Design an enzyme around this catalytic site. Sequence first.
Site, PDB file in Angstrom:
ATOM      1  CD  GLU C 129      -2.861  -1.164   2.441  1.00 16.20           C
ATOM      2  OE1 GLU C 129      -2.922  -0.132   3.161  1.00 16.20           O
ATOM      3  OE2 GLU C 129      -3.572  -2.162   2.589  1.00 16.20           O
ATOM      4  CG  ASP C 131       0.636   5.892   3.864  1.00 11.90           C
ATOM      5  OD1 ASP C 131       1.593   6.603   3.497  1.00 11.90           O
ATOM      6  OD2 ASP C 131      -0.535   6.273   3.767  1.00 11.90           O
ATOM      7  CD  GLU C 244       7.752 -12.454  -4.902  1.00 14.02           C
ATOM      8  OE1 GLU C 244       6.719 -12.490  -5.588  1.00 14.02           O
ATOM      9  OE2 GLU C 244       8.031 -11.480  -4.151  1.00 14.02           O
ATOM     10  CD  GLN C 281      47.725  -7.114 -13.212  1.00 13.67           C
ATOM     11  OE1 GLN C 281      47.907  -6.193 -12.402  1.00 13.67           O
ATOM     12  NE2 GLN C 281      48.651  -8.054 -13.457  1.00 13.67           N
ATOM     13  CG  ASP C 369      18.354  -1.044   3.439  1.00 10.63           C
ATOM     14  OD1 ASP C 369      19.597  -1.192   3.460  1.00 10.63           O
ATOM     15  OD2 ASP C 369      17.808  -0.206   2.711  1.00 10.63           O
TER      16      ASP C 369
HETATM   17  C1  LIG Z   1       9.697  -4.856  -9.426  1.00 12.28           C
HETATM   18  C2  LIG Z   1       8.752  -4.761  -8.214  1.00 12.28           C
HETATM   19  C3  LIG Z   1       7.649  -5.632  -8.259  1.00 12.28           C
HETATM   20  C4  LIG Z   1       6.786  -5.573  -7.154  1.00 12.28           C
HETATM   21  N1  LIG Z   1       5.604  -6.434  -7.126  1.00 12.28           N
HETATM   22  C5  LIG Z   1       4.750  -6.398  -6.048  1.00 12.28           C
HETATM   23  C6  LIG Z   1       3.536  -7.278  -6.146  1.00 12.28           C
HETATM   24  O1  LIG Z   1       3.324  -7.942  -7.137  1.00 12.28           O
HETATM   25  N2  LIG Z   1       2.682  -7.237  -5.015  1.00 12.28           N
HETATM   26  C7  LIG Z   1       2.893  -6.328  -3.848  1.00 12.28           C
HETATM   27  O2  LIG Z   1       2.129  -6.275  -2.936  1.00 12.28           O
HETATM   28  N3  LIG Z   1       4.069  -5.461  -3.852  1.00 12.28           N
HETATM   29  C8  LIG Z   1       4.979  -5.535  -4.904  1.00 12.28           C
HETATM   30  N4  LIG Z   1       6.112  -4.700  -4.878  1.00 12.28           N
HETATM   31  C9  LIG Z   1       6.357  -3.722  -3.802  1.00 12.28           C
HETATM   32  C10 LIG Z   1       7.449  -4.125  -2.818  1.00 12.28           C
HETATM   33  O3  LIG Z   1       6.827  -4.984  -1.926  1.00 12.28           O
HETATM   34  C11 LIG Z   1       7.869  -2.834  -2.088  1.00 12.28           C
HETATM   35  O4  LIG Z   1       8.389  -1.932  -3.057  1.00 12.28           O
HETATM   36  C12 LIG Z   1       8.945  -3.193  -1.107  1.00 12.28           C
HETATM   37  O5  LIG Z   1       8.415  -3.936  -0.029  1.00 12.28           O
HETATM   38  C13 LIG Z   1       9.542  -1.903  -0.543  1.00 12.28           C
HETATM   39  O6  LIG Z   1       8.488  -0.968  -0.022  1.00 12.28           O
HETATM   40  P1  LIG Z   1       8.420   0.511  -0.508  1.00 12.28           P
HETATM   41  O7  LIG Z   1       8.646   0.616  -1.975  1.00 12.28           O
HETATM   42  O8  LIG Z   1       7.238   1.210   0.050  1.00 12.28           O
HETATM   43  O9  LIG Z   1       9.885   1.132   0.107  1.00 12.28           O
HETATM   44  P2  LIG Z   1       9.968   1.764   1.604  1.00 12.28           P
HETATM   45  O10 LIG Z   1       9.574   0.750   2.564  1.00 12.28           O
HETATM   46  O11 LIG Z   1       9.396   3.164   1.625  1.00 12.28           O
HETATM   47  O12 LIG Z   1      11.643   1.830   1.679  1.00 12.28           O
HETATM   48  C14 LIG Z   1      12.290   3.078   1.399  1.00 12.28           C
HETATM   49  C15 LIG Z   1      13.746   2.889   2.030  1.00 12.28           C
HETATM   50  O13 LIG Z   1      13.626   2.775   3.375  1.00 12.28           O
HETATM   51  C16 LIG Z   1      14.346   1.528   3.772  1.00 12.28           C
HETATM   52  N5  LIG Z   1      13.718   1.075   5.015  1.00 12.28           N
HETATM   53  C17 LIG Z   1      12.351   0.934   5.319  1.00 12.28           C
HETATM   54  N6  LIG Z   1      12.238   0.368   6.508  1.00 12.28           N
HETATM   55  C18 LIG Z   1      13.522   0.198   6.977  1.00 12.28           C
HETATM   56  C19 LIG Z   1      13.953  -0.328   8.148  1.00 12.28           C
HETATM   57  N7  LIG Z   1      13.216  -0.839   9.261  1.00 12.28           N
HETATM   58  N8  LIG Z   1      15.284  -0.437   8.386  1.00 12.28           N
HETATM   59  C20 LIG Z   1      16.163  -0.011   7.437  1.00 12.28           C
HETATM   60  N9  LIG Z   1      15.729   0.516   6.294  1.00 12.28           N
HETATM   61  C21 LIG Z   1      14.414   0.626   6.074  1.00 12.28           C
HETATM   62  C22 LIG Z   1      14.124   0.684   2.684  1.00 12.28           C
HETATM   63  O14 LIG Z   1      15.097  -0.422   2.691  1.00 12.28           O
HETATM   64  C23 LIG Z   1      14.420   1.641   1.491  1.00 12.28           C
HETATM   65  O15 LIG Z   1      15.858   1.845   1.397  1.00 12.28           O
HETATM   66  C24 LIG Z   1       7.017  -4.749  -6.031  1.00 12.28           C
HETATM   67  C25 LIG Z   1       8.137  -3.908  -6.015  1.00 12.28           C
HETATM   68  C26 LIG Z   1       8.967  -3.957  -7.085  1.00 12.28           C
HETATM   69  C27 LIG Z   1      10.270  -3.010  -7.043  1.00 12.28           C
HETATM   70  C1  LIG Z   2      53.820 -14.968   6.599  1.00  7.88           C
HETATM   71  C2  LIG Z   2      54.709 -15.305   5.388  1.00  7.88           C
HETATM   72  C3  LIG Z   2      55.320 -16.570   5.440  1.00  7.88           C
HETATM   73  C4  LIG Z   2      56.120 -16.902   4.337  1.00  7.88           C
HETATM   74  N1  LIG Z   2      56.805 -18.194   4.317  1.00  7.88           N
HETATM   75  C5  LIG Z   2      57.587 -18.544   3.240  1.00  7.88           C
HETATM   76  C6  LIG Z   2      58.294 -19.866   3.346  1.00  7.88           C
HETATM   77  O1  LIG Z   2      58.195 -20.548   4.341  1.00  7.88           O
HETATM   78  N2  LIG Z   2      59.078 -20.210   2.215  1.00  7.88           N
HETATM   79  C7  LIG Z   2      59.284 -19.308   1.042  1.00  7.88           C
HETATM   80  O2  LIG Z   2      59.993 -19.602   0.131  1.00  7.88           O
HETATM   81  N3  LIG Z   2      58.606 -18.015   1.038  1.00  7.88           N
HETATM   82  C8  LIG Z   2      57.757 -17.675   2.089  1.00  7.88           C
HETATM   83  N4  LIG Z   2      57.104 -16.428   2.055  1.00  7.88           N
HETATM   84  C9  LIG Z   2      57.310 -15.450   0.972  1.00  7.88           C
HETATM   85  C10 LIG Z   2      56.151 -15.341  -0.011  1.00  7.88           C
HETATM   86  O3  LIG Z   2      56.332 -16.392  -0.896  1.00  7.88           O
HETATM   87  C11 LIG Z   2      56.337 -14.001  -0.751  1.00  7.88           C
HETATM   88  O4  LIG Z   2      56.266 -12.956   0.212  1.00  7.88           O
HETATM   89  C12 LIG Z   2      55.210 -13.860  -1.731  1.00  7.88           C
HETATM   90  O5  LIG Z   2      55.360 -14.768  -2.802  1.00  7.88           O
HETATM   91  C13 LIG Z   2      55.238 -12.443  -2.305  1.00  7.88           C
HETATM   92  O6  LIG Z   2      56.594 -12.068  -2.830  1.00  7.88           O
HETATM   93  P1  LIG Z   2      57.303 -10.764  -2.355  1.00  7.88           P
HETATM   94  O7  LIG Z   2      57.148 -10.560  -0.889  1.00  7.88           O
HETATM   95  O8  LIG Z   2      58.672 -10.657  -2.916  1.00  7.88           O
HETATM   96  O9  LIG Z   2      56.257  -9.569  -2.977  1.00  7.88           O
HETATM   97  P2  LIG Z   2      56.457  -8.975  -4.478  1.00  7.88           P
HETATM   98  O10 LIG Z   2      56.366 -10.066  -5.430  1.00  7.88           O
HETATM   99  O11 LIG Z   2      57.583  -7.966  -4.507  1.00  7.88           O
HETATM  100  O12 LIG Z   2      54.979  -8.183  -4.556  1.00  7.88           O
HETATM  101  C14 LIG Z   2      54.944  -6.775  -4.286  1.00  7.88           C
HETATM  102  C15 LIG Z   2      53.552  -6.313  -4.918  1.00  7.88           C
HETATM  103  O13 LIG Z   2      53.607  -6.476  -6.262  1.00  7.88           O
HETATM  104  C16 LIG Z   2      52.414  -7.286  -6.651  1.00  7.88           C
HETATM  105  N5  LIG Z   2      52.778  -7.976  -7.891  1.00  7.88           N
HETATM  106  C17 LIG Z   2      53.944  -8.704  -8.191  1.00  7.88           C
HETATM  107  N6  LIG Z   2      53.796  -9.271  -9.376  1.00  7.88           N
HETATM  108  C18 LIG Z   2      52.567  -8.865  -9.845  1.00  7.88           C
HETATM  109  C19 LIG Z   2      51.947  -9.157 -11.013  1.00  7.88           C
HETATM  110  N7  LIG Z   2      52.385  -9.947 -12.121  1.00  7.88           N
HETATM  111  N8  LIG Z   2      50.703  -8.674 -11.253  1.00  7.88           N
HETATM  112  C20 LIG Z   2      50.100  -7.900 -10.309  1.00  7.88           C
HETATM  113  N9  LIG Z   2      50.722  -7.608  -9.168  1.00  7.88           N
HETATM  114  C21 LIG Z   2      51.954  -8.083  -8.947  1.00  7.88           C
HETATM  115  C22 LIG Z   2      52.245  -8.134  -5.557  1.00  7.88           C
HETATM  116  O14 LIG Z   2      50.886  -8.703  -5.558  1.00  7.88           O
HETATM  117  C23 LIG Z   2      52.400  -7.135  -4.372  1.00  7.88           C
HETATM  118  O15 LIG Z   2      51.197  -6.322  -4.281  1.00  7.88           O
HETATM  119  C24 LIG Z   2      56.271 -16.069   3.207  1.00  7.88           C
HETATM  120  C25 LIG Z   2      55.632 -14.822   3.184  1.00  7.88           C
HETATM  121  C26 LIG Z   2      54.867 -14.495   4.253  1.00  7.88           C
HETATM  122  C27 LIG Z   2      54.109 -13.074   4.202  1.00  7.88           C
HETATM  123 CL   LIG Z   3      48.033  -4.564 -15.911  1.00  7.28          CL
END
Ligand SMILES: Cc1cc2nc3c(=O)[nH]c(=O)nc-3n(C[C@H](O)[C@H](O)[C@H](O)COP(=O)(O)OP(=O)(O)OC[C@H]3O[C@@H](n4cnc5c(N)ncnc54)[C@H](O)[C@@H]3O)c2cc1C
Ligand SMILES: Cc1cc2nc3c(=O)[nH]c(=O)nc-3n(C[C@H](O)[C@H](O)[C@H](O)COP(=O)(O)OP(=O)(O)OC[C@H]3O[C@@H](n4cnc5c(N)ncnc54)[C@H](O)[C@@H]3O)c2cc1C
Ligand SMILES: [Cl-]
Lengths: 383, 383, 383, 383
Positions: C129, C131, C244, C281, C369
């Site tokens: 509803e 409310d 649901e 990456q 929530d």
């Molecule tokens: C795609 C879709 C299909 C739907 N189909 C149906 C259906 O077929 N039949 C039906 O009856 N209803 C349906 N609904 C309604 C749905 O039940 C309500 O939208 C939903 O329960 C949220 O109520 P509201 O929109 O009034 O948001 P409100 O309750 O007004 O929420 C607003 C914000 O307040 C947060 N909030 C509210 N209370 C708290 C709390 N205690 N703690 C923390 N945060 C809170 C909410 O998480 C949200 O961030 C549908 C809704 C959608 C999005």
């Molecule tokens: C608690 C602990 C116990 C250990 N025990 C052993 C053991 O018993 N025997 C042993 O041989 N070694 C051991 N190690 C070593 C561990 O193998 C190395 O620390 C680990 O492989 C990381 O190498 P490095 O410290 O030279 O970091 P580096 O390789 O210099 O990394 C530095 C940063 O560069 C990042 N990085 C490096 N290459 C890339 C890449 N291609 N792409 C993206 N990011 C990259 C790394 O993720 C990191 O954020 C231990 C390490 C720890 C923390």
């Molecule tokens: Cl990269």
Amino acid sequence: MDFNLSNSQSDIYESAYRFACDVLDQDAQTRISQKILSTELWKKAAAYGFAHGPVSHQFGGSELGALDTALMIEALGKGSRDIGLSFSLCAHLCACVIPLYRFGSSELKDKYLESLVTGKLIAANAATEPDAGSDIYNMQATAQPCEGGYILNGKKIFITNAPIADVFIIYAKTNPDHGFLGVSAFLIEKGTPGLNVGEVIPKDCLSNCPWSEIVFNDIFIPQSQRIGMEGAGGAIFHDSMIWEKGCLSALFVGGLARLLETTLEYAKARQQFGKAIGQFQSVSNRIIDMKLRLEQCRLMLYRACWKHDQGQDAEADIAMSKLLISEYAVQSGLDAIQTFGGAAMDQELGLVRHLLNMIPSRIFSGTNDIQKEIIARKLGLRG
Amino acid sequence: MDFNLSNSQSDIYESAYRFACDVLDQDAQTRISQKILSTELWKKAAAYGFAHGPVSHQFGGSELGALDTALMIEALGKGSRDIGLSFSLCAHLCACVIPLYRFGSSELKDKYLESLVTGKLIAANAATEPDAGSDIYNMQATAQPCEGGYILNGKKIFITNAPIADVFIIYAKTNPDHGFLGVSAFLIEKGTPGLNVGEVIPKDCLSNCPWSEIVFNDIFIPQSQRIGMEGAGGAIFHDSMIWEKGCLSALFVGGLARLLETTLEYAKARQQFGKAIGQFQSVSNRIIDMKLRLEQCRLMLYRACWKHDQGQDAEADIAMSKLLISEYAVQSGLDAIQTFGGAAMDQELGLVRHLLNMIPSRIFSGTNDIQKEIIARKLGLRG
Amino acid sequence: MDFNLSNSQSDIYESAYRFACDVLDQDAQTRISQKILSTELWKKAAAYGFAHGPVSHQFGGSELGALDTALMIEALGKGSRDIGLSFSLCAHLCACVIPLYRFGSSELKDKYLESLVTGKLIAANAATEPDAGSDIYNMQATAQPCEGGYILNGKKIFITNAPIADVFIIYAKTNPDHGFLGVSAFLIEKGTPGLNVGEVIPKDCLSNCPWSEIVFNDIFIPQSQRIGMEGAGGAIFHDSMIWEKGCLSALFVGGLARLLETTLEYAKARQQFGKAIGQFQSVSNRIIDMKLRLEQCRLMLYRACWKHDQGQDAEADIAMSKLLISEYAVQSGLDAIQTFGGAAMDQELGLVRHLLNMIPSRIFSGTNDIQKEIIARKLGLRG
Amino acid sequence: MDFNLSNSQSDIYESAYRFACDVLDQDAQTRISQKILSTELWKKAAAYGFAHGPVSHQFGGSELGALDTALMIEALGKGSRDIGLSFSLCAHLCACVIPLYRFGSSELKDKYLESLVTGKLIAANAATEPDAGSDIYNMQATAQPCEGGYILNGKKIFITNAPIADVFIIYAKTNPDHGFLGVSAFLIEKGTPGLNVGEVIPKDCLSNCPWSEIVFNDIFIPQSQRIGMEGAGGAIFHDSMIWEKGCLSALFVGGLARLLETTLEYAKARQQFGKAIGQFQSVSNRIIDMKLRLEQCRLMLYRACWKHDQGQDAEADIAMSKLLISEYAVQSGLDAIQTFGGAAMDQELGLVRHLLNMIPSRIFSGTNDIQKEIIARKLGLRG
Ligand SMILES: Cc1cc2nc3c(=O)[nH]c(=O)nc-3n(C[C@H](O)[C@H](O)[C@H](O)COP(=O)(O)OP(=O)(O)OC[C@H]3O[C@@H](n4cnc5c(N)ncnc54)[C@H](O)[C@@H]3O)c2cc1C
Ligand SMILES: Cc1cc2nc3c(=O)[nH]c(=O)nc-3n(C[C@H](O)[C@H](O)[C@H](O)COP(=O)(O)OP(=O)(O)OC[C@H]3O[C@@H](n4cnc5c(N)ncnc54)[C@H](O)[C@@H]3O)c2cc1C
Ligand SMILES: [Cl-]
Ligand SMILES: Cc1cc2nc3c(=O)[nH]c(=O)nc-3n(C[C@H](O)[C@H](O)[C@H](O)COP(=O)(O)OP(=O)(O)OC[C@H]3O[C@@H](n4cnc5c(N)ncnc54)[C@H](O)[C@@H]3O)c2cc1C
Ligand SMILES: Cc1cc2nc3c(=O)[nH]c(=O)nc-3n(C[C@H](O)[C@H](O)[C@H](O)COP(=O)(O)OP(=O)(O)OC[C@H]3O[C@@H](n4cnc5c(N)ncnc54)[C@H](O)[C@@H]3O)c2cc1C
Ligand code: PRO
Ligand code: PRO
Ligand code: PRO
Ligand code: PRO
Ligand SMILES: [Cl-]
């Protein structure tokens, strides 16, 4: 709209950076290894100016604005590895020096403020309790008014600098029926009867920055040691947390600038598969995230501090800055470790220690969930 | 399609869990505080069965499959806080016991394998070099064939267990003109002339699990100590890393099960603002993320191990499992710390130490970027 | 623990996939372009078996379990581009066929159920509803008991299939003093006096799946058309939402399998800078995210459905599955578009239309929530 | 450091905002529904000033700087829903007006530039080819020098405004042996023999902004229609993409400001469970993400444009701005839809259409992966 520092601002930054590099950073690895907080070094840093902030010349400060104070502390964060010492100093500045300056009586400032500003006395602020953390205004410590002042009872925990402090800025209920409006603030001295400062409690994060619990057993607080008005302690605390959020955020911006420089240098120098590891997009994409974070959150912090200096309402901007800076500090610490691979485990490089030092930034001065509550309230989402 | 454990599997899990809780976990906090790896306790764990894996009865094993081995190690990760000891044991099993069993000659297995399986001898595997980490097959250590065997020179770094190992499984080039195809594997003994095992190098992560560098200066390796065929060492190493990825992933699944239980209990018990902190959606949403992660990655690991046990190609599934488990272990460690707030700093609770112990999981056995390269190759994205 | 499909399950999947590819998908682009929901094609799909689910042979079903039903619908999602038609069919099955089968009287099933099962009659469910959305049990439509049955008044919105339905499964308060316990369920026919079905309301997402509002003005509901017991409608609705959540999640798993195949093929074939774009990456890391998502959420769905088939409590597992599947469907739709670049804008390829079709999955059957609230309650975080 | 707009800047913004609201936005819903690009309205917008940018008064411009141009376009994005018309206008400005002004000869500017600046002539830029997108400098169109000018052959795709353009700014190889250094730029007129402009190719994103393919079959380009020097076309194109990245980023900042206002209003007004939905942290946390994004990326854009106006190197800052703005535009579009729930499906509200309009921002002017490559190169990670 201008994004250049003035010459004055540039000089403040560069002087603080030189002091952090040439004085605080020298010998830092030994202190960090031994978990030492050097109170002689801390006092030099305080007197250099890190304990001054906005304090007037009358009390030994330089009357810096918020942006200037933030630049000094950004420089400190970039230039000294001893982040525990820096954190201790900034807690003293923001949670103790600044509320005394902003709310203290003439009498109380005349007795204590210049000593805090020069670091002759070290201060700790004590608000948090076992059952009052985020819900800080539900604290239960009581300062019961009596003839001549107050009787103080209660327990405070997580108190930065408590094992080394000479004075404590403490918050307690003068009216336990209310929350925020029942709190008052007081200054008390180490050694006063009934004050029991606990032994340092070790931690892995910020590991050389001491904290402990303190317990109050029937402490008498003389009337003149109340800071500001009766019942204004909630507001004083809140105000001091705005300064704190901004200044520790500055420390971690500077730390992120340092971390990014280290990480870029490594990614250019370390080769695998016949090329610098920064040439792989998995590696460079994280470093770019670190750069994006640094540039964004530095601008947010500068704008928040500048708005304050302009007289505009900057509290939401500070909460946003603190939330961004601390999240980005932690994430970028993780990204740096991933860049270095196995070489990140090296205690001399300090990358894991750096991440540990950033982990509490998301908790301190109000957790980041609480910052979101503050911002939600400013946005009109809290009624 | 069935998602129940057999009675046999349930018994394997529950017996390992009891051993981890009642034997390894008892006294763990003292060992962790002192950074002690108890070799007597390690030997009890090895003999109990954690050093057996797929090894046949002929050599003292139980002929477990991959899924059974993973269940044992999941139980170990959930039941013992001494994750450094568990990591050491699993490295011995996966990188040393298993390649000797799978590729060793009858002669070499007859001399050494049962001793490794019962933990009478501790083993370290040494592949990584200062210039060969992710690019492992560009290693430069040389095992130059000579009359009677090989002359070995080179340097290996980051070698788990090297300061405590009796034997070393080492990889070196018998044909330095090639990469992967020029590597061979050898077993060498502690004390052989020219083997210099470095002093333990401390680290904050996995801090009681020792590692160091080893240097080879003109070591003579007798012919009979080559593991598998000439030039097959690249393949042996790669195969051992598939076992390693799967078994350490199991350890961290079990650790995540333990962390989730601790975090749920706290979020129900800790009150602020007059209600359990789990009632705030900022708090419960992170705990739900932890639960989602645990359920998803446990299923991925079980399927990867079961496919291997079925004879199907499971290498991509193992790379996916390792990538998910290690990322989710780190993220959930962060989420737990955020749940606890200031209480996370407590060394007795171990939450920060837990995060530190998970940080290397994304590097070990091939970094997660390398896992993505492996998966990209399986998906046909690498030519 | 087994991750293979039985031959029976494999046959169910492959027969549904053939029907989706060879019957529903043929000519889909024309229907999609013209925003046509072909009721003749819908009826063929219903009769083929997509409207059967767990219904017994007595009423024309195949007595499939939840996992078999999910496999059929996964095949449908992978094989037919006409996701709007598939969504319409699954809404009919899960929100109308299944509650009538599970709770209807013998009389009511005898009159209507086989016709719904064969698609002779199309059904819409009407709970929401203006409310009452997430707060569905605060609905205000009233079915006031009277001599002979009920007088129904109210308005329902967002009703899938309402412009094409022959019958409506409607929820309304028989006791407006209560919430969940005051709701009852009824079946009413198109054309009954006082039923005003609105004109189709267009939408860009699921754009050929019709929905509209319906209004009840003093409808008389005969007693025999109540579904289940008085006051049980809240529970019937909730039960139908578990079916649901699981079946639309299956549709979107199949859609993600199709999207991944398309995206992998493109990333291998499209060259820039002299190589396949999958070799960068930045590109391959997103495709790997899509693969990881697909494998994880397929396993979560299969386990949830299998637990239900085993008689175990599967409601939390279904809420987790729905939350993962819909989030991963949207994210992977975004990742595919980014893979294709400018070529993603092509309406013939359907990638933007695919993302639009996934956007409502996070809202439908309870928003994500609300799924988190359900999981939090199962985890003990809601008191 | 200053974060206030000057009065001049404030006036530029407010005048553009009024024009977007009172002229372009009036009747926008009808044009959007019918997929109409009103060339009479486009010409009014061009003449108002949106086609002027940095062009001098000599040619009908206002000599705006980059920051002023960005403010105008931010206002346009906030004030008019007809984002397809705005995109068309900004493409004309940034990819055609600006390179002609910056590199054209006096003769060529005298003949064409004021007509483009006032919108008397509409222009399209044509660089992309079927095998040259991100790898744009591998384009294969050839402008073979001949007596009197060039013979042009080739095919260009994805050309915004081609079905409505009077002139085309085209890029082709004058030396096909080279890449970037073999490209030259030319202006050609609609109707020149051998120019075949394709029919509009529909799309769901930016759906009323026309684009098509164009084919060149032995076009004769007179010498005087080359833009800039022989072989400088790669640099001209690259320069025009810096302007484009910045100006479309401004459009999407303004669109995000509008979206945030709409979303905040709804979250305060819509009640469920007896309170505004913004009171649930799942809801407010996403809105706070939208706010954080807006504030951060607006500052990044302003700084990038201001640095350019200062003469500083701003290319990396522009690439960072474009990468942030387009990602944040898409994410915030998703967050708004989740805020509204079922009400997001309403075509009149335009929230799904808004997301569709943002999806191409991550592709246009160089994909966001390419922006990362640009930033990596500036950071020294590309050799
Ligand atoms: C795609 C879709 C299909 C739907 N189909 C149906 C259906 O077929 N039949 C039906 O009856 N209803 C349906 N609904 C309604 C749905 O039940 C309500 O939208 C939903 O329960 C949220 O109520 P509201 O929109 O009034 O948001 P409100 O309750 O007004 O929420 C607003 C914000 O307040 C947060 N909030 C509210 N209370 C708290 C709390 N205690 N703690 C923390 N945060 C809170 C909410 O998480 C949200 O961030 C549908 C809704 C959608 C999005
Ligand atoms: C608690 C602990 C116990 C250990 N025990 C052993 C053991 O018993 N025997 C042993 O041989 N070694 C051991 N190690 C070593 C561990 O193998 C190395 O620390 C680990 O492989 C990381 O190498 P490095 O410290 O030279 O970091 P580096 O390789 O210099 O990394 C530095 C940063 O560069 C990042 N990085 C490096 N290459 C890339 C890449 N291609 N792409 C993206 N990011 C990259 C790394 O993720 C990191 O954020 C231990 C390490 C720890 C923390
Ligand atoms: Cl990269
Ligand atoms: C390094 C450090 C130094 C410190 N120094 C001092 C000092 O010098 N003086 C002092 O008095 N205190 C100090 N503190 C304590 C700090 O004030 C508290 O830790 C902080 O306020 C959080 O309270 P708590 O630890 O009790 O966490 P809790 O409040 O128990 O929080 C636990 C979880 O619940 C969440 N949560 C709580 N309420 C809500 C809510 N309404 N909505 C959403 N989520 C919620 C929190 O965000 C967190 O995720 C320090 C803390 C740290 C980490
Ligand atoms: C709305 C819109 C309007 C447009 N208007 C015009 C116009 O008016 N004039 C004109 O000439 N063109 C125009 N274009 C085309 C635009 O220039 C190209 O779409 C864009 O450059 C991307 O090229 P492509 O589509 O061929 O994608 P491809 O280059 O094929 O990219 C496919 C994927 O590969 C990634 N990729 C490619 N190379 C790399 C790499 N080195 N590293 C990492 N990832 C890589 C891409 O990021 C993307 O994820 C427009 C495009 C759009 C979407
Ligand atoms: O008002 C604030 O800012 C404090 C910080 C810790 C709890 N709330
Ligand atoms: O082949 C593998 O699996 C190894 C692991 C470290 C480097 N590459
Ligand atoms: O109980 C449930 O599952 C329903 C779904 C929409 C609102 N709550
Ligand atoms: O140089 C640039 O900025 C262009 C944009 C599309 C491909 N590369
Ligand atoms: Cl909440």
